[PDB]
Amino acid sequence: CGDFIAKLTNNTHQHVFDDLSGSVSLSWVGDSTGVILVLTTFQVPLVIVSFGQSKLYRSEDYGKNFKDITNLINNTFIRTEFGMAIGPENSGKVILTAEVSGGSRGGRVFRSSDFAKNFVQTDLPFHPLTQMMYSPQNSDYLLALSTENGLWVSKNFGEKWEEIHKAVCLAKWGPNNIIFFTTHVNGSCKADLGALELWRTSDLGKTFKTIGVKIYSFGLGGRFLFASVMADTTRRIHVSTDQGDTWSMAQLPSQEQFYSILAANEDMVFMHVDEPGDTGFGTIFTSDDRGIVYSKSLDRHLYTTTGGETDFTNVTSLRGVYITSTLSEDNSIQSMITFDQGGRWEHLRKPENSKCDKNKNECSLHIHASYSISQKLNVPMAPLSEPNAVGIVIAHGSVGDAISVMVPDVYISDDGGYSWAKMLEGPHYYTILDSGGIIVAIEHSNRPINVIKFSTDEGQCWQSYVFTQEPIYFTGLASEPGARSMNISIWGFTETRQWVSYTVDFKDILERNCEEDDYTTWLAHSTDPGDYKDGCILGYKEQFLRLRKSSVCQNGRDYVVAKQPSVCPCSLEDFLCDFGYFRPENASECVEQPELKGHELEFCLYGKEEHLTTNGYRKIPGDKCQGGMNPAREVKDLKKKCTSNFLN
Amino acid sequence: CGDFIAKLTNNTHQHVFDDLSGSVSLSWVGDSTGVILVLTTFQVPLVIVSFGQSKLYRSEDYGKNFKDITNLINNTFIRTEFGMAIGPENSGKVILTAEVSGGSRGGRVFRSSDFAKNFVQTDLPFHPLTQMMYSPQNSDYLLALSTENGLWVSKNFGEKWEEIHKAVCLAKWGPNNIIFFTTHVNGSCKADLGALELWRTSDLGKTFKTIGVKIYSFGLGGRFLFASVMADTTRRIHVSTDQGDTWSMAQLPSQEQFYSILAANEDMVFMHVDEPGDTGFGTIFTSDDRGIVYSKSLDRHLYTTTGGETDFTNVTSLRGVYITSTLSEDNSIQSMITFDQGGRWEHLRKPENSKCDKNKNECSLHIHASYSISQKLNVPMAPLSEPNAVGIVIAHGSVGDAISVMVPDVYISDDGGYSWAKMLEGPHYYTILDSGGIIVAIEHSNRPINVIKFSTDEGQCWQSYVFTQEPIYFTGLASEPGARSMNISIWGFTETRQWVSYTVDFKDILERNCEEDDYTTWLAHSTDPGDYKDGCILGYKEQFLRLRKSSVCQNGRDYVVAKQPSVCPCSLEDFLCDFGYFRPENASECVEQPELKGHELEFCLYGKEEHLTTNGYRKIPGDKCQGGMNPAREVKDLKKKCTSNFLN
Ligand SMILES: *[C@@H]1O[C@H](CO)[C@@H](O[C@@H]2O[C@H](CO)[C@@H](O[C@@H]3O[C@H](CO)[C@@H](O)[C@H](O)[C@@H]3O)[C@H](O)[C@H]2NC(C)=O)[C@H](O)[C@H]1NC(C)=O
Ligand SMILES: *[C@@H]1O[C@H](CO)[C@@H](O[C@@H]2O[C@H](CO)[C@@H](O[C@@H]3O[C@H](CO)[C@@H](O)[C@H](O)[C@@H]3O)[C@H](O)[C@H]2NC(C)=O)[C@H](O)[C@H]1NC(C)=O
Ligand SMILES: *[C@@H]1O[C@H](CO)[C@@H](O[C@@H]2O[C@H](CO)[C@@H](O[C@@H]3O[C@H](CO)[C@@H](O)[C@H](O)[C@@H]3O)[C@H](O)[C@H]2NC(C)=O)[C@H](O)[C@H]1NC(C)=O
Ligand SMILES: *[C@@H]1O[C@H](CO)[C@@H](O[C@@H]2O[C@H](CO)[C@@H](O[C@@H]3O[C@H](CO)[C@@H](O)[C@H](O)[C@@H]3O)[C@H](O)[C@H]2NC(C)=O)[C@H](O)[C@H]1NC(C)=O
Ligand SMILES: *[C@@H]1O[C@H](CO)[C@@H](O)[C@H](O)[C@H]1NC(C)=O
Ligand SMILES: *[C@@H]1O[C@H](CO)[C@@H](O)[C@H](O)[C@H]1NC(C)=O
């Protein structure tokens, strides 16, 4: 790689908080408002009334000075489990949900509509079981669940509440202020698992519509509405794209299996299926634009026995990139990555400049996510990435040795995960701001720390800055919202403990705007060899930018050239495997599954028996390729009517 | 209350361990053998083959010096989940279960029959899924479950392994070397919940017997065998006292409720039943000497929604004493204690000399146990008691303030939980040795520590001793086994971390034997007023001893006078409430349940319809009172045969 102190010392702002008990929370509120709220919270069970008092501080000068405003919430306290209830980014809505320290017949909330500058008190006609839920369509609409399983809505932002149903088990918002929720009759929700009923409301609670029966669970994802249904006993999954008017059971090749949705968009659906026997690993399947017909996409996917957590991450810094973790035939764990939205996975390339090279399964990079947390491994954070920071991925990774599993390191990718480099030794808390101009990490240890590690050139070069002469036990790291933000907030405590917050500003470090000479063009990776598809991602070609090495300048432009997307010709990577086909390890072409050979491929689609005839290729939902490779397929109707639905 | 340093500094033995990875475990092996093992373990998923090496140190001088014996276990490693497998106290058996560092087709064990002084290496014909399991009747027999759900046994202390059944979900030893397990057929055990089968072997695996069908789960306790059965769907609990030859369904007063067993011994059985509605509280029922006929004992019993953990605790330091935590009418958590084996519960007396006196529910002592851990409160250890140390109880407690909940304190009872006293500020790890003569505790914090707190007068006076000028981060505290043990072991590390263990010996502190002038007589508490039953516990009267205040002497005698138990006359406290009756709050007499008044009390006992007629009193199983109060009851047979069994 290859003065910076005075730039940060003049912009390091400290503030000490005295006599704080319990857990300490800190949240910037909105973009470029200077509002930071610090909140004391306490771990108290939900059905218990306890005596306690939450301290509440508000800054309006970007972490310089804080004003105690606890008088606003006198005689109340905030559960850690709840915390704050911030709304959308530019909505200025902030709710604080609390309980009356003496106890009351109802909860008490503090609603702000001006980025926490002025609050009004409103007492609740119930005890809230779960936090407030904003409608994504309308910040003024709110709902939450009572401790008596009652569903409460407000049309005027928590001022006037109305109870709309009394037997509710779960409730989640939908598009256009539609609310879905399960209900029952006999006893408890835990008792009537498999006999619930799924309802829908288009009128905030005026009218209802029962969309389903014999329900075990439900959930949302992208343009899909999911519901697990029990026929008696066995359990099967159904999907609807029309907010529950019409359903169809999901169709898989190859009983008594357990299902799990991994993600979903406006395009497709990732579903994981445990291998019979509950062996510890399963199979991922991918759906079409309707989310009905599923095909094998990745074998031997690890999941935690208790919980089902998986290393599956949606890499936000590159479209159509997902990384997960799988079990090799030698029973060594491997990180897999797809660049074509689950069309074809590839082993994660070992990191350059780290020649481990003994055993072959050894020295492979494993990236740590939700499975690795679940196995109680020393991983402070999941893989982090921001949409604005194209190509930048930061995560925790390990070599094939049990010593490196106990002490993971921080790796950085600049190309959506194609190439990796160990950048920090040992675990760290990281965050991304400035649209990727600034990368800040902070060591995670049992000893007090006082070292900020940051990076201005997309993680390629790092530098350390001691922000205080008094090391503090680390507690939290918050970044200011905004694409061009340069303000962070670190808080912790000393040793009766004394909390303290430092607001560091990178204004004087990044004062010069970057010119075109500080950027360097680079294309995304394409699994298909040759230049003819170099940079093609689901049929679109886009050129990218990147900060040079040791670049210390403020970016004002987006990393996409925004010239024009040129359409690429269709190739293998632009197609998923069809129903009954899969791609074997390291392989590029799809082949029929062994157990289905010589048998007629049949499935059931919206109460119809359908016969499939393919070359084994299905266009990727969302792929925009044209011309080139064009594998055919046909879906003809049959005679039988079949039964593809277990609800009405 | 009202020199001690030289007595401990000369007896503090430090040993430094260099270059250790992973978790560190430390254990004494046997009574007065001076064998201490130290083991390195690693957090690796069970299904993964990883490369690793577990370090292993033996001391045979009670902690003074340790010999690295890792070469005994070269090229293997031990999982943290497995740790050691120590047999019975005086058996001398030690197993070390490990996996081959490269991966293998079996595990590999290291067996020792001589208090860990010599080990033999044996390879397993299977990957162990669960740790080894000794038979309580014969320490030579072991058994274990393989990763392929294979049940394996050994009649010759893990030397020769034999697979006796291949579809085993769970298996558990029994009296006289009998083995219980569950089997299935279709798919996984997770898929055959409610369709399992319960089997039994008296011949270590030669002969089998299917004792129950349609099984959900099962367990052992005291002289009872339990088994949750599914009817279709609904779930009911069955009990058998004859190792599974004849069963009966449990009989409760007052559908689709969730059952749980709390404890059970050679006399009676404690059951918890979630209130319909999964409201976060339930109701405790006790049985008779046959484990069938249940009767309300404590209402509004708190349980954790996810997992069902409760605060129930068996004060093994006093016969007939148990403590748990209930939800008052004021939604405040309260500790409730019984001194008559669940016959009549009483609020836990607030501590003296701590005149908190604001609110009535406030200043109530809440004792933290399993429910409080489930709720993730800052509680390092549960209540601790030793049957050798009569009356001694130590645990973690709180006032009704949310601040005090966050930082619990440690309280002490010398009278079996009748009276309590705040003795230490803040959470601590604590432990008991010398049969109550020495009580040691260690601060629980983020900062490294170097201070031991100990007490030589059964918790009444305390004293600190700084055992090292090099503070260390705390990890573990172990005592030497024995009735008169005086050696402890403290281990932790500095900051690449460096582990270190200190063996402190209280020989020079307790050199003078206690005479009779150092003891003071005291009787146990009896709920019934008056002296005529003062000291009566389930019909037996026994006088107790106690060390005076500020007593620093070595006890050589047991705290029970062992004169002779005099039988007490029967009173209320010596009777449980009958079927359909209960004792209300603060109340002494049993009354019929409201919903059963005017209705004929009927239940079903071993396929018989039985009609009950009582005054509402049932002799306590194990109560030895004679004469005095004698409430009658009658159980007459009827005409109907009824159906009290779902397993054939
Ligand atoms: C990131 O941090 C910088 C601080 O280095 C923030 O800049 C601060 O912006 C406020 C806006 O209120 C400045 O206060 C005043 O704004 C009024 C607007 O009428 C203006 O007339 C005054 O002259 C003054 O600028 C504040 O001075 C400025 N900070 C410093 C240290 O000067 C910035 O807003 C933060 N967040 C981002 C970039 O979103
Ligand atoms: C998986 O991650 C990718 C990026 O990692 C996510 O892709 C992003 O999806 C969102 C919503 O589909 C897109 O937002 C867009 O907002 C504009 C605002 O005007 C709107 O007009 C568009 O209709 C769309 O909603 C976003 O552009 C897109 N990212 C990129 C790079 O294009 C994806 O949603 C994540 N989850 C999946 C695939 O389920
Ligand atoms: C832990 O406590 C024990 C007592 O509970 C201390 O006892 C030590 O025991 C050993 C024997 O294992 C004594 O050594 C000798 O035993 C032989 C017989 O084999 C005998 O002929 C000798 O006369 C002698 O007794 C040793 O003396 C004894 N230690 C002391 C200080 O007397 C043990 O020392 C305690 N742990 C620590 C770390 O001090
Ligand atoms: C609460 O703790 C007490 C501690 O005593 C539990 O144990 C019961 O204790 C007595 C005395 O130790 C046991 O005596 C038995 O002695 C015979 C021979 O004299 C022996 O064969 C037995 O194996 C046993 O040691 C009694 O059986 C024991 N209960 C059990 C589980 O065996 C009491 O069980 C605990 N609370 C409950 C109600 O579970
Ligand atoms: C696939 O390629 C990887 C290296 O990229 C190699 O370790 C593995 O053995 C190959 N597997 C097969 C089945 O070809
Ligand atoms: C029971 O006694 C406790 C104090 O031991 C008291 O606080 C409570 O109000 C009493 N309740 C009833 C119903 O008598």
Side-chain angles (χ1 to χ4, degrees):
Chain A
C1 288
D3 192 13
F4 67 109
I5 301 292
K7 304 297 182 59
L8 291 173
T9 300
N10 289 30
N11 303 265
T12 300
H13 310 284
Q14 176 197 64
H15 184 290
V16 179
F17 300 93
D18 297 327
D19 301 306
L20 295 195
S21 303
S23 300
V24 165
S25 314
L26 189 150
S27 296
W28 296 76
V29 182
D31 192 355
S32 300
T33 66
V35 185
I36 303 172
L37 294 177
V38 184
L39 182 67
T40 276
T41 57
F42 304 86
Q43 262 296 351
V44 170
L46 192 50
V47 287
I48 271 64
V49 183
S50 191
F51 298 96
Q53 177 61 61
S54 282
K55 322 271 312 165
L56 184 51
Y57 302 87
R58 180 219 294 131
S59 176
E60 298 171 358
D61 54 356
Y62 305 84
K64 188 68 178 182
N65 304 280
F66 289 74
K67 176 173 185 179
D68 204 333
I69 54 166
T70 309
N71 300 334
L72 181 55
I73 55 172
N74 189 18
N75 209 265
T76 51
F77 73 105
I78 306 275
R79 305 186 184 271
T80 312
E81 310 290 347
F82 285 78
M84 320 187 202
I86 317 292
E89 170 70 4
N90 301 331
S91 84
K93 315 285 184 184
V94 171
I95 300 293
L96 263 54
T97 307
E99 289 300 337
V100 175
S101 192
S104 167
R105 83 179 169 273
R108 186 189 292 190
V109 299
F110 298 92
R111 333 178 277 102
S112 176
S113 191
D114 56 336
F115 298 101
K117 291 181 186 295
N118 296 275
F119 287 80
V120 290
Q121 171 176 341
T122 296
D123 289 66
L124 293 192
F126 59 86
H127 285 328
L129 176 58
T130 53
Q131 191 52 275
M132 302 278 163
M133 306 281 317
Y134 296 78
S135 183
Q137 190 70 17
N138 192 342
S139 84
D140 298 321
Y141 293 158
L142 289 181
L143 64 81
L145 207 53
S146 79
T147 59
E148 293 187 344
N149 299 97
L151 178 51
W152 290 92
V153 296
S154 159
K155 315 175 192 299
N156 51 341
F157 176 70
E159 177 184 351
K160 172 191 181 64
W161 294 93
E162 305 161 28
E163 180 189 41
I164 61 185
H165 202 293
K166 304 192 49 192
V168 176
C169 302
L170 177 54
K172 303 172 181 186
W173 271 112
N176 299 319
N177 306 326
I178 297 180
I179 302 169
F180 309 92
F181 65 94
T182 52
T183 178
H184 66 294
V185 45
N186 293 328
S188 60
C189 301
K190 191 181 175 189
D192 287 22
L193 286 182
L196 309 184
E197 293 184 14
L198 190 63
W199 296 26
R200 183 192 82 178
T201 290
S202 306
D203 304 336
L204 287 320
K206 285 307 162 55
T207 46
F208 297 88
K209 182 185 184 289
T210 289
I211 54 191
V213 301
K214 314 163 182 196
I215 301 306
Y216 186 93
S217 66
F218 85 113
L220 280 73
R223 56 179 304 260
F224 305 90
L225 177 60
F226 307 87
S228 196
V229 184
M230 181 168 309
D232 305 5
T233 69
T234 325
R235 202 181 310 161
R236 293 297 179 256
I237 302 293
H238 307 46
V239 186
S240 169
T241 55
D242 52 11
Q243 313 314 318
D245 294 326
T246 67
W247 297 77
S248 182
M249 171 171 152
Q251 307 291 319
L252 287 81
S254 298
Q255 194 68 26
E256 63 246 4
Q257 291 158 321
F258 293 86
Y259 303 91
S260 149
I261 308 300
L262 295 169
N265 48 14
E266 314 273 336
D267 295 314
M268 61 172 277
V269 149
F270 289 77
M271 179 194 302
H272 170 88
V273 187
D274 295 333
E275 279 288 301
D278 222 19
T279 155
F281 63 84
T283 312
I284 312 189
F285 290 73
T286 52
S287 93
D288 53 346
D289 51 334
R290 289 170 301 184
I292 310 297
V293 179
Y294 291 72
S295 62
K296 253 191 192 64
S297 161
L298 184 39
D299 274 322
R300 305 175 71 80
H301 185 210
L302 297 169
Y303 65 95
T304 300
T305 314
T306 307
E309 292 85 355
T310 53
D311 268 354
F312 194 83
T313 320
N314 179 5
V315 167
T316 55
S317 56
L318 204 44
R319 180 169 51 108
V321 173
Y322 310 82
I323 287 192
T324 178
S325 285
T326 57
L327 195 55
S328 77
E329 299 297 344
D330 296 333
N331 290 318
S332 50
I333 175 175
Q334 294 170 334
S335 272
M336 302 289 292
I337 172 174
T338 165
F339 301 80
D340 45 340
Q341 220 183 21
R344 166 187 182 184
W345 297 72
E346 291 142 289
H347 292 80
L348 185 72
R349 297 188 54 258
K350 302 160 183 211
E352 295 78 344
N353 309 326
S354 287
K355 42 194 68 172
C356 168
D357 71 84
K358 273 159 296 193
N359 187 21
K360 277 63 186 304
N361 290 327
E362 201 184 330
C363 317
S364 305
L365 190 62
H366 169 220
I367 300 307
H368 297 273
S370 332
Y371 177 85
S372 309
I373 316 312
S374 306
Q375 306 291 329
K376 298 182 175 58
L377 306 178
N378 183 19
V379 182
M381 279 188 69
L384 176 52
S385 59
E386 298 293 347
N388 298 326
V390 186
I392 308 184
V393 186
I394 177 154
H396 284 84
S398 301
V399 195
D401 309 325
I403 285 79
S404 192
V405 173
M406 291 291 308
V407 192
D409 308 315
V410 180
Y411 291 79
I412 288 286
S413 158
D414 288 331
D415 42 9
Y418 173 85
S419 63
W420 289 91
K422 180 190 305 191
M423 288 295 168
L424 306 167
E425 293 290 340
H428 287 61
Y429 291 93
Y430 38 85
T431 183
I432 310 299
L433 46 87
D434 189 19
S435 295
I438 307 178
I439 309 178
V440 194
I442 302 171
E443 171 191 335
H444 160 66
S445 60
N446 310 79
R447 56 178 193 191
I449 50 92
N450 58 326
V451 181
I452 278 295
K453 300 158 183 166
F454 65 102
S455 191
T456 56
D457 58 335
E458 307 188 317
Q460 304 188 47
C461 291
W462 293 81
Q463 187 74 37
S464 299
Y465 163 74
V466 179
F467 58 99
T468 178
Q469 298 302 136
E470 173 72 20
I472 67 173
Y473 290 92
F474 178 80
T475 306
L477 177 48
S479 288
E480 182 185 21
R484 305 311 177 186
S485 44
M486 315 176 195
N487 300 274
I488 55 176
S489 295
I490 326 145
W491 70 99
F493 61 95
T494 65
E495 175 184 2
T496 63
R497 68 192 45 180
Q498 185 193 51
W499 297 81
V500 57
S501 67
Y502 298 89
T503 300
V504 183
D505 181 36
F506 293 90
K507 164 193 67 181
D508 295 331
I509 289 284
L510 306 181
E511 47 181 336
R512 179 185 66 89
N513 300 320
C514 301
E515 53 180 357
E516 297 183 346
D517 299 329
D518 306 324
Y519 303 96
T520 293
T521 63
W522 67 283
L523 301 183
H525 178 49
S526 81
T527 78
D528 274 332
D531 307 322
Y532 91 124
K533 276 186 84 84
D534 203 338
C536 304
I537 302 176
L538 317 163
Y540 269 157
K541 177 174 193 175
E542 296 182 328
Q543 193 170 35
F544 293 156
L545 296 181
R546 174 179 312 174
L547 291 168
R548 299 193 162 182
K549 197 181 175 185
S550 65
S551 285
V552 185
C553 55
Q554 160 65 24
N555 186 20
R557 70 217 298 177
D558 48 6
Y559 286 97
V560 180
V561 181
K563 189 250 180 182
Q564 245 174 9
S566 46
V567 179
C568 296
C570 300
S571 73
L572 284 178
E573 64 176 332
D574 296 304
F575 293 89
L576 300 174
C577 289
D578 206 321
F579 184 52
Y581 291 72
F582 67 105
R583 274 180 182 94
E585 184 177 305
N586 297 330
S588 55
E589 306 185 334
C590 300
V591 297
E592 205 184 1
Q593 301 183 206
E595 61 278 12
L596 310 175
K597 290 189 168 194
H599 306 285
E600 298 295 341
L601 298 182
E602 295 178 10
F603 54 82
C604 195
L605 201 153
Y606 280 104
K608 278 188 185 170
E609 267 300 327
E610 300 287 359
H611 183 268
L612 172 63
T613 296
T614 171
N615 305 125
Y617 290 88
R618 282 209 73 161
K619 185 74 74 67
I620 303 186
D623 197 291
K624 309 286 187 189
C625 76
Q626 294 173 21
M629 186 174 292
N630 44 11
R633 62 189 298 267
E634 165 189 44
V635 188
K636 53 183 178 74
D637 207 323
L638 296 184
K639 184 194 50 50
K640 297 182 178 311
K641 298 181 291 188
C642 151
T643 61
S644 83
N645 207 346
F646 293 88
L647 34 84
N648 63 99
Chain B
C1 279
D3 189 17
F4 68 102
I5 297 286
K7 300 301 186 50
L8 297 169
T9 307
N10 292 26
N11 301 264
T12 302
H13 312 282
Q14 181 197 71
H15 192 271
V16 190
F17 298 86
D18 299 323
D19 297 303
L20 295 188
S21 300
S23 318
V24 170
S25 323
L26 182 153
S27 306
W28 296 73
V29 177
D31 196 354
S32 295
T33 68
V35 179
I36 299 172
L37 297 172
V38 188
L39 187 63
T40 274
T41 57
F42 302 99
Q43 246 315 337
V44 169
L46 194 49
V47 294
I48 270 71
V49 175
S50 196
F51 292 103
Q53 183 59 65
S54 305
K55 313 281 311 179
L56 183 64
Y57 301 80
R58 198 208 287 122
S59 178
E60 308 188 357
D61 57 357
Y62 300 87
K64 182 62 168 192
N65 310 277
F66 286 85
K67 186 184 171 181
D68 190 339
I69 49 163
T70 309
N71 310 325
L72 170 64
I73 47 163
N74 192 26
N75 205 267
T76 53
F77 72 111
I78 308 273
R79 304 184 190 268
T80 306
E81 321 287 353
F82 278 85
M84 320 190 198
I86 310 301
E89 172 72 6
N90 298 339
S91 64
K93 317 281 180 183
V94 184
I95 300 308
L96 266 58
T97 311
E99 294 291 345
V100 177
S101 201
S104 178
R105 84 178 172 274
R108 177 191 308 188
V109 307
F110 305 90
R111 326 177 284 101
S112 192
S113 180
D114 48 340
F115 302 101
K117 304 176 167 278
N118 293 274
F119 289 82
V120 288
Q121 175 175 333
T122 306
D123 288 79
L124 301 179
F126 66 90
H127 284 326
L129 164 72
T130 41
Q131 195 60 284
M132 303 286 162
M133 293 300 299
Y134 299 69
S135 171
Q137 180 81 14
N138 194 335
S139 66
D140 278 352
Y141 300 153
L142 303 182
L143 77 81
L145 210 54
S146 72
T147 52
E148 301 182 347
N149 296 112
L151 178 45
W152 292 92
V153 285
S154 169
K155 322 167 194 299
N156 60 342
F157 183 72
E159 179 183 350
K160 180 189 184 50
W161 288 97
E162 303 162 30
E163 185 186 34
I164 66 184
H165 211 282
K166 300 186 72 175
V168 175
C169 306
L170 174 64
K172 294 182 184 178
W173 268 118
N176 300 318
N177 302 320
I178 297 176
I179 303 180
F180 303 88
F181 64 96
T182 52
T183 177
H184 66 304
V185 42
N186 295 328
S188 78
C189 297
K190 195 181 168 186
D192 278 14
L193 286 179
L196 309 181
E197 288 188 358
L198 185 63
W199 290 36
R200 183 194 70 179
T201 295
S202 294
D203 307 337
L204 291 311
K206 287 303 169 62
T207 51
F208 294 88
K209 183 176 186 297
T210 307
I211 58 180
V213 292
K214 307 182 182 189
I215 312 302
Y216 187 87
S217 54
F218 83 113
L220 282 82
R223 55 176 303 257
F224 305 97
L225 179 51
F226 303 87
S228 198
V229 179
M230 198 159 298
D232 301 9
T233 70
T234 324
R235 214 184 299 161
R236 290 302 179 262
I237 307 300
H238 296 56
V239 190
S240 178
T241 49
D242 50 13
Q243 308 303 298
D245 290 322
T246 66
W247 292 78
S248 201
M249 181 171 135
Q251 300 301 316
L252 272 90
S254 306
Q255 197 66 20
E256 60 253 352
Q257 292 159 312
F258 287 91
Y259 299 95
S260 173
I261 305 306
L262 290 179
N265 65 335
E266 307 280 330
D267 294 317
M268 60 173 290
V269 163
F270 288 78
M271 180 191 302
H272 169 86
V273 181
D274 304 330
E275 280 290 309
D278 224 16
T279 166
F281 66 90
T283 305
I284 286 177
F285 294 69
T286 65
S287 70
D288 63 327
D289 48 335
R290 289 165 300 175
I292 315 295
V293 177
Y294 287 80
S295 43
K296 262 192 177 58
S297 183
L298 183 30
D299 268 320
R300 310 178 60 77
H301 182 204
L302 289 173
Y303 69 98
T304 297
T305 300
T306 306
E309 302 78 346
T310 61
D311 269 351
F312 197 80
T313 308
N314 183 19
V315 193
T316 68
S317 60
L318 197 46
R319 183 169 46 110
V321 186
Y322 315 70
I323 291 192
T324 185
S325 282
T326 60
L327 188 58
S328 81
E329 304 298 342
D330 300 338
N331 294 338
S332 67
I333 183 169
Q334 289 165 342
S335 291
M336 297 306 278
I337 170 179
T338 168
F339 300 80
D340 48 336
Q341 211 175 46
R344 165 177 186 194
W345 293 86
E346 290 144 289
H347 299 72
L348 185 73
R349 299 179 63 263
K350 312 169 177 191
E352 300 79 352
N353 303 328
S354 290
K355 40 206 52 188
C356 160
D357 71 81
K358 271 155 296 194
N359 183 36
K360 275 67 184 298
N361 283 325
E362 201 187 323
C363 316
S364 279
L365 186 49
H366 166 218
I367 299 297
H368 303 285
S370 309
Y371 180 83
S372 300
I373 313 299
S374 300
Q375 307 293 326
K376 294 170 181 68
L377 295 184
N378 182 22
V379 176
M381 291 183 57
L384 170 57
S385 55
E386 297 289 351
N388 297 334
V390 180
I392 292 183
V393 183
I394 169 149
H396 286 85
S398 301
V399 200
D401 307 325
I403 283 77
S404 185
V405 176
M406 282 302 302
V407 193
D409 304 330
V410 189
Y411 296 77
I412 286 294
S413 163
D414 295 328
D415 48 9
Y418 183 73
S419 57
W420 294 85
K422 193 193 294 181
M423 292 294 179
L424 303 177
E425 297 287 346
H428 286 60
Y429 295 89
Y430 42 75
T431 187
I432 300 296
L433 49 89
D434 192 11
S435 285
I438 301 171
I439 308 184
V440 194
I442 298 186
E443 179 186 335
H444 170 53
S445 67
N446 311 96
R447 53 186 187 184
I449 41 85
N450 62 344
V451 185
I452 272 286
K453 306 167 171 168
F454 69 100
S455 168
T456 64
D457 51 344
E458 297 185 303
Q460 304 180 50
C461 293
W462 293 75
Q463 197 57 41
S464 295
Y465 164 66
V466 171
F467 62 93
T468 178
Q469 300 297 125
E470 182 55 33
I472 65 182
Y473 284 92
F474 173 82
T475 309
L477 174 65
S479 292
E480 174 192 15
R484 301 307 169 188
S485 42
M486 306 179 202
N487 295 328
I488 54 165
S489 298
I490 314 157
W491 75 89
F493 63 89
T494 59
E495 166 187 2
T496 71
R497 70 198 31 192
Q498 185 193 51
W499 297 81
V500 56
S501 67
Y502 299 89
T503 300
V504 183
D505 181 36
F506 293 90
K507 164 193 67 181
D508 295 331
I509 289 284
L510 306 181
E511 47 181 336
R512 179 185 66 89
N513 300 320
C514 301
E515 53 180 357
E516 297 183 346
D517 299 329
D518 306 324
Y519 303 96
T520 293
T521 62
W522 67 283
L523 301 183
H525 178 49
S526 81
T527 78
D528 274 332
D531 307 322
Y532 91 124
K533 276 186 84 84
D534 203 338
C536 304
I537 302 176
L538 317 163
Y540 269 157
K541 177 174 193 175
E542 296 182 328
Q543 193 170 35
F544 293 156
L545 296 181
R546 174 179 312 174
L547 291 168
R548 299 193 162 182
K549 197 181 175 185
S550 65
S551 285
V552 185
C553 55
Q554 160 65 24
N555 187 20
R557 70 217 298 177
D558 49 6
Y559 286 97
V560 180
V561 181
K563 189 250 180 182
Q564 245 174 9
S566 46
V567 179
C568 296
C570 300
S571 73
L572 284 178
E573 64 176 332
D574 296 304
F575 293 89
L576 300 174
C577 288
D578 206 321
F579 184 52
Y581 291 72
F582 67 105
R583 274 180 182 94
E585 184 177 305
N586 298 330
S588 55
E589 306 185 334
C590 300
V591 297
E592 205 184 1
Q593 301 183 206
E595 61 278 12
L596 310 175
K597 290 189 168 194
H599 306 285
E600 298 295 341
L601 298 182
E602 295 178 10
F603 54 82
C604 195
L605 201 153
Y606 280 104
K608 278 188 185 170
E609 267 300 327
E610 300 287 359
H611 183 268
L612 172 63
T613 296
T614 171
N615 305 125
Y617 290 88
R618 282 209 73 161
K619 185 74 74 67
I620 303 186
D623 197 291
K624 309 286 187 189
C625 76
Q626 294 173 21
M629 186 174 292
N630 44 11
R633 62 189 298 267
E634 165 189 44
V635 188
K636 53 183 178 74
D637 207 323
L638 296 184
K639 184 194 50 50
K640 297 182 178 311
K641 298 181 291 188
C642 151
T643 61
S644 83
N645 207 346
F646 289 90
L647 29 92
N648 101 78

